[PDB]
Design an enzyme around this catalytic site. Structure first.
Site, short mmCIF file in Angstrom:
data_model
loop_
_atom_site.label_atom_id
_atom_site.label_comp_id
_atom_site.label_asym_id
_atom_site.label_seq_id
_atom_site.Cartn_x
_atom_site.Cartn_y
_atom_site.Cartn_z
N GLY A 192 41.38 -26.53 -24.18
CA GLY A 192 41.70 -26.73 -22.88
C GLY A 192 43.34 -27.24 -23.39
CB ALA A 226 44.09 -32.09 -21.70
CD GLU A 255 48.16 -22.50 -17.54
OE1 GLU A 255 49.17 -22.61 -16.44
OE2 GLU A 255 48.10 -23.58 -18.09
CB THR A 274 40.60 -23.78 -20.72
OG1 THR A 274 41.20 -22.63 -20.13
CG2 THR A 274 40.44 -23.08 -22.17
N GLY A 275 38.63 -26.56 -20.35
CA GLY A 275 38.13 -27.50 -21.18
C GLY A 275 36.45 -27.80 -21.12
CD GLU A 277 38.80 -35.12 -13.50
OE1 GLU A 277 39.17 -34.22 -13.98
OE2 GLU A 277 39.12 -36.26 -13.32
CE1 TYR A 291 48.91 -35.05 -18.28
CE2 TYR A 291 48.02 -37.10 -18.68
CZ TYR A 291 47.93 -36.06 -18.08
OH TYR A 291 47.04 -36.02 -16.85
CG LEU A 321 32.37 -36.43 -39.65
CD1 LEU A 321 32.52 -35.12 -39.20
CD2 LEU A 321 33.25 -37.28 -38.66
CD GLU A 377 27.65 -43.44 -43.51
OE1 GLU A 377 28.03 -44.61 -43.07
OE2 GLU A 377 26.89 -43.63 -44.52
#
Lengths: 309, 426, 412
Positions: free
Chosen positions: C9, C11, C44, C118-119, C156, C197, C225, C227
């Site tokens: 995404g 973001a 995009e 996309t996210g 959203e 941002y 990880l 963990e």
């Protein structure tokens, strides 16, 4: 107001799938749902819920048997000069079309086999009886479907009809075609015709579909009367706009006991308002474990309706 | 995003000329000229109302529907009249009789297909469609009947895109027509069941607001129209501009309609001060909310003070503090807790554009969904019955292929519509 | 040993460019050094292009930069089903081509923005296709879930109730960083009404550095990880802890920097410093992984924490005696040369599962209904290969996430 529940047997497809039969009807008015459940730890347990109905029908029960307990007692009501309604309610594939229209896993087949036909059969027989004969009644039938707030005449090639309401608030569906019937054979012809014409999507591999609300009606008319002597509306509901109609339907039926509009309730409104009016609701249930969520939804809805009793 | 205006009837049309008179200047588009825009921002979002063909000719994407030539032939023979592509003019040289029935069932019903045709040519223009703007008067043929049909068809073709409706509900005191409640009750009916945002304006609520809030002594129609068009610019077009907190038709819709009826609003502009003198500039902000939220200044006929609100949308458009905006709104919500309905913790929908009305420093369109508008459909509905009872000028309807149950229908419907709206005032 | 990362995404990609920046910055690997270890997905082009045009341009392989010139669409459906589908294969290919090249990996740190097209959608099936292709690993997805009142997209929730239900049965541990609740930190704990941002990104870009970067880096109390998920999730729901950082002081204004452990740790539990609008309004913690970095004496911790364990007003779950995973690293943090981050010699990136999100989910679920209740922008998904099913059936989904996060707590 009478409310009943009918469990359909597991179909071959479900059986092959090895679907588990979650429902039991140990008594004439008791229906039990053996809900499978898992705790957070994923322990398996059964929460068996019990529901009581005026009549509870097992998978063995035939349409004739179901008809005897639900619709049959209503026919006299129309001869009495009342307005009767019978609704088939339930999830998709629960058996509503099969029960009303005729036996078919496709929901489409032998008209004679279904409640519309059986009810008609009784109408002709009763009309012939001595108490009734003096009445000099004529029998008329109509079949239409409601789809997305629109009414279509199944008798007149899906012709779109307009529905108006007066200040008086009485509703009329203009253009609805009434056909004169003097024989059960006649009614069967009209049922076949309407059913073929019924709405749906593309030809599905199997089964019909209930995108719409099906309503077949039997009207008795001398020369008007209370706008006709009596009327019986048999409705094949869409699988549980649809939500609003179902919500609307519940309130109208419950209103019947005492005395957020939808098309279906609007067309049917005269059937709820009168003092001499009776209704029967038949809740269809698919026994498969996969459908358990759907069934509880159906049953709970049913409970509230009967509650008015 | 985009939209496609619709000038139904003469009024809705006359106003078109004013809505486009404005909007254009609020987008630097000269008659047939292009974008002379004093800035560069009045262009990145124009699309919402135009189309690219030449390179200097951005043509308004609206529709001009009317059964009376002379009208569109006055709008097309005057100022900005020569910017609409002729294809836009869907005329009906027939007898534009003042009958709702004559422009909805008999005469208009024909001209419809030749309209929908274009409403599709414009919709399938490009990018993504948002909705359609609809102007008209509920007191005539080409307005209430034919325009009320145009939508019933539009809303079957794209039950996705929105439908804002700008209706000139029949002013009280004096009716500029006689059957008025007939043409009206019949069109409101169609409205409560197709468009999902209606902004009702009253020729006399305007006069008032235009003769006392603008010492204006000779408020010609052009004016009224002009004032109205001022609000519909703040609404749409505006929000299609940047902003600390911007919204768009939907936000406006999805924040203003608690219950599906569609509900009708009442628009109010902000700086509404007389020319010379008054130019007080008391526009810090408390001055705009002072304005917008008073009784007078509501383009509607009814007075808010006569019924709670369900929703409110102060669509401001001029650099201000998201604090002095977000704040004010509050006190306002507390000084008048009385009328503002409670089951909505924050009735108000603060919206905030950036660039203001071309020549002004700070403005704010008001779109109120108050229960007060109950006391208007009442009015209308009354006038009906008082005359329906005697079937007054009914032969002009029936004789045009109508129904005695059609009028019944509408009144009831729209009459019930009054009922419901009270369900919240309480 | 390693942990791939898939920034999905726009973001997740902006945040990606950021977290990816902080990295080299504290590893002495300028613009053009080694080779990353992640990928970039978006429908995009113009955004991934920013990684192709802007800074850190040649530090990537045009192979770990996936794009679908087509259309993004701020709608789950389209991104998951319809469009997003076409790319997935290709996407996977890299996380199977990059997953092979390595040596005994541990998982994929996924970066997405819950409420996007996309996210939300895409990933939904990306993580989806992972849980099956590598069920035998860690799936920690680092999300930026919907601002409590300052959302952007009109839909959203549709996009976030849908990315939650589809990913829920696929993630290992989902980290959460609230976009708005981070602004507060930029207003209240750093002072600046000018937060680009590019800043919030520098921040998560920090908290994240504390997760992988430094942790996978030697220390006095290493934490793998795995963990995490082990010491961090009490139950299979891809449980979502919250990220928090301690020395979030301004590198200009105030200067008390030298804020011994005893302080920076207390600064984690005050709700005004947690990158999430889930103020411990009642949510009982049930496990916290206090990752420290810099000069820290284990006793200082095994004391600073003791003091906390007995503050009670910090009420930890019942069924949990001790829920404090103390992770100690050596190398202190590494602040951007001249952004706005103080630059201390020790920090506390504490993350945790708190019965608090019972809220955040609630408030986000409710949203959904309101619109679904009217179908709002439903026609936008249906027409994109979805059904009344996926919505209604993903609503019921989260419903049992409101009961779950309720049952695992509030009760003894």
């Amino acid at each position: 107001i009478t409310v009943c529940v009918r469990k359909r047997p597991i179909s071959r497809k479900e059986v092959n799938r090895k679907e588990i039969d979650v429902i039991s009807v140990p008594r004439k008015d008791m229906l039990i749902v053996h809900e499978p459940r898992s705790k957070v730890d994923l322990t398996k347990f059964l929460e068996n819920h019990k529901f009581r109905f005026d009549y509870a029908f097992n998978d063995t029960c035939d349409n004739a048997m179901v008809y005897k307990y639900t619709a049959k007692p209503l026919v006299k009501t129309i001869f009495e000069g009342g307005m009767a309604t019978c609704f088939a309610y339930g999830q998709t594939g629960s058996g509503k079309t099969h029960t009303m229209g005729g036996e078919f896993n496709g929901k489409v087949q032998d008209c004679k086999n279904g409640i519309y036909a059986m009810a008609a059969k009784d109408v002709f027989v009763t009309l012939n009886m001595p108490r009734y004969r003096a009445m000099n009644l004529v029998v008329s039938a109509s079949f239409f479907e409601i789809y997305s707030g629109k009414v279509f005449d199944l008798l007149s090639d899906k012709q779109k009809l307009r529905v108006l309401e007066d200040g008086k608030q009485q509703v009329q569906v203009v253009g609805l075609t009434e056909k004169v019937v003097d024989g059960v054979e006649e009614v069967l012809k009209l049922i076949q015709h309407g059913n073929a014409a019924r709405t749906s999507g593309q030809t599905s591999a199997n089964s019909n579909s209930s995108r719409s609300h099906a309503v077949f009606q039997i009207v008795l008319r001398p020369q008007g009367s209370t706008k006709i002597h009596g009327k019986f509306s048999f409705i094949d509901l869409a699988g549980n706009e649809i939500n609003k109609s179902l919500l609307a339907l519940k309130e109208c039926i419950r209103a019947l006991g005492k005395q957020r509009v939808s098309k279906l309730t609007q067309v049917l409104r005269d059937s709820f308002i009168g003092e001499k009016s009776k209704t029967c609701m038949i809740a269809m249930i698919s026994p498969g474990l996969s459908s358990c969520e759907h069934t509880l939804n159906t049953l709970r809805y049913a409970d509230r309706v009967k509650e008015l009793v | 995003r985009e939209i496609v205006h619709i000038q139904a009837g003469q009024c809705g049309n006359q106003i078109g000329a004013k809505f486009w008179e404005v909007i254009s200047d609020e987008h630097g588009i000269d008659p047939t000229g292009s974008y002379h825009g004093d800035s560069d921002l009045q262009l990145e979002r124009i699309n919402v109302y135009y189309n690219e063909a030449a390179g200097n000719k951005y043509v308004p994407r609206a529709i001009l529907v009317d059964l009376e030539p002379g009208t569109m032939d006055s709008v097309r023979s005057g100022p900005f009249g020569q910017i609409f592509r002729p294809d836009n003019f869907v005329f009906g040289q027939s007898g534009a009789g003042n009958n709702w029935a004559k422009g909805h069932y008999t005469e208009g019903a024909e001209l419809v297909d030749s309209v929908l045709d274009v409403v599709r040519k414009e919709s399938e223009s490009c990018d993504c469609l948002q909705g359609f703007q609809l102007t008209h008067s509920l007191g005539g043929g080409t307005g209430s009947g034919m325009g009320t049909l145009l939508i019933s068809k539009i809303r079957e073709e794209y039950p996705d895109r929105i439908m804002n409706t700008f209706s000139v509900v029949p002013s009280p005191k004096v009716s500029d027509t006689v059957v008025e409640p007939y043409n009206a009750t019949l069109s409101v009916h169609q409205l409560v069941e197709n468009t999902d945002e209606t902004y009702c304006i009253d020729n006399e609520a305007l006069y008032d607001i235009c003769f006392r809030t603008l010492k204006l002594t000779t408020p010609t129609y052009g004016d009224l129209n002009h004032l109205v068009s001022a609000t519909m610019s703040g609404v749409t077009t505006c929000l299609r501009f940047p902003g600390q907190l911007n919204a768009d038709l939907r936000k406006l819709a999805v924040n203003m309609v608690p219950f599906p009826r569609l509900h009708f609003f009442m628009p109010g502009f902000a700086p509404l001060t007389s020319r010379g003198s008054q130019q007080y500039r008391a526009l810090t902000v408390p001055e705009l909310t002072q304005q917008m939220f008073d009784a007078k200044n509501m383009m509607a006929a009814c007075d808010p003070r006569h019924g709670r609100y369900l929703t409110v949308a102060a669509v401001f458009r001029g650099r201000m503090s998201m604090k002095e905006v977000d704040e004010q709104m509050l006190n306002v919500q507390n000084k008048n807790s009385s009328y503002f309905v409670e089951w909505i913790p924050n009735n108000v929908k603060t919206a905030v554009c950036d660039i203001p009305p071309r020549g002004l420093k700070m403005s704010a369109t008001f779109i109120g969904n108050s229960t007060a508008i109950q006391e208007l459909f009442k009015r209308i509905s009354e006038q009906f019955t008082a005359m329906f009872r005697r079937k007054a000028f009914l032969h002009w309807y029936t004789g045009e292929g109508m129904d005695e149950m059609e009028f019944t229908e509408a009144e009831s419907n729209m009459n019930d519509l009054v009922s419901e709206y009270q369900q919240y005032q309480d | 040993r390693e942990c791939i990362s898939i920034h999905v995404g726009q973001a997740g990609v902006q945040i990606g460019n950021a977290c990816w920046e902080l990295y080299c910055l504290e590893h002495g690997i300028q613009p053009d050094g080694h080779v990353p270890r992640a990928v970039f997905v978006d429908l995009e082009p113009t955004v991934i292009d920013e990684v192709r045009t802007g800074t850190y341009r040649q530090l990537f392989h045009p192979e770990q930069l996936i794009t679908g010139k087509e259309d993004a669409a701020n709608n789950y459906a389209r991104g998951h089903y319809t469009i997003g589908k076409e790319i997935i294969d290709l996407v996977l290919d890299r996380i199977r081509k990059l997953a092979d090249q390595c040596t005994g990996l541990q998982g994929f740190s996924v970066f997405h923005s819950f409420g996007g097209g996309t996210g939300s959608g895409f990933t939904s099936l990306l993580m989806e296709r992972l849980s099956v292709d590598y069920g035998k690993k860690s799936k920690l997805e680092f999300s930026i879930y919907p601002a409590p009142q300052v959302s952007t997209a009109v839909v959203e929730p549709y996009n976030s109730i849908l990315t939650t239900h589809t990913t829920l049965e696929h993630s290992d541990c989902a980290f959460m960083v609230d976009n708005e609740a981070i602004y507060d930190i930029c207003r209240r704990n750093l002072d600046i009404e000018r937060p680009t941002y590019t800043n919030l990104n520098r921040l998560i870009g920090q908290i994240v550095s504390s997760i992988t970067a430094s942790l996978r880096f030697d220390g006095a109390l290493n934490v793998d990880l795995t963990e995490f998920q082990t010491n961090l999730v009490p139950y299979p729901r891809g449980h979502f802890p919250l990220a928090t950082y301690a020395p979030v002081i301004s590198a200009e204004k105030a200067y008390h920097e030298q804020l011994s452990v005893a302080e920076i740790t207390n600064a984690c539990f005050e709700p005004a410093n947690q990158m999430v609008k889930c103020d411990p309004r009642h949510g009982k913690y049930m496990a916290c992984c206090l990752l420290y970095r810099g000069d820290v004496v284990p006793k200082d911790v095994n004391a600073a924490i003791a003091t906390i364990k007995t503050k009670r007003t910090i009420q930890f779950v019942d069924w949990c005696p001790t829920g404090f995973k103390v992770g100690i690293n050596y190398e202190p943090p590494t602040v951007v040369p001249g952004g706005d981050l103080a630059k201390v010699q020790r920090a506390v990136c504490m993350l945790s599962n708190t019965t608090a999100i019972a809220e955040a989910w609630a408030r986000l679920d409710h949203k959904f209904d309101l619109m679904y209740a009217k179908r709002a922008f439903v026609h936008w998904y249906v027409g994109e290969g979805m059904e009344e099913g996926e919505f209604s059936e993903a609503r019921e989904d989260m419903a049992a996430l409101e009961k779950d996060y309720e049952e695992v707590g509030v009760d003894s």
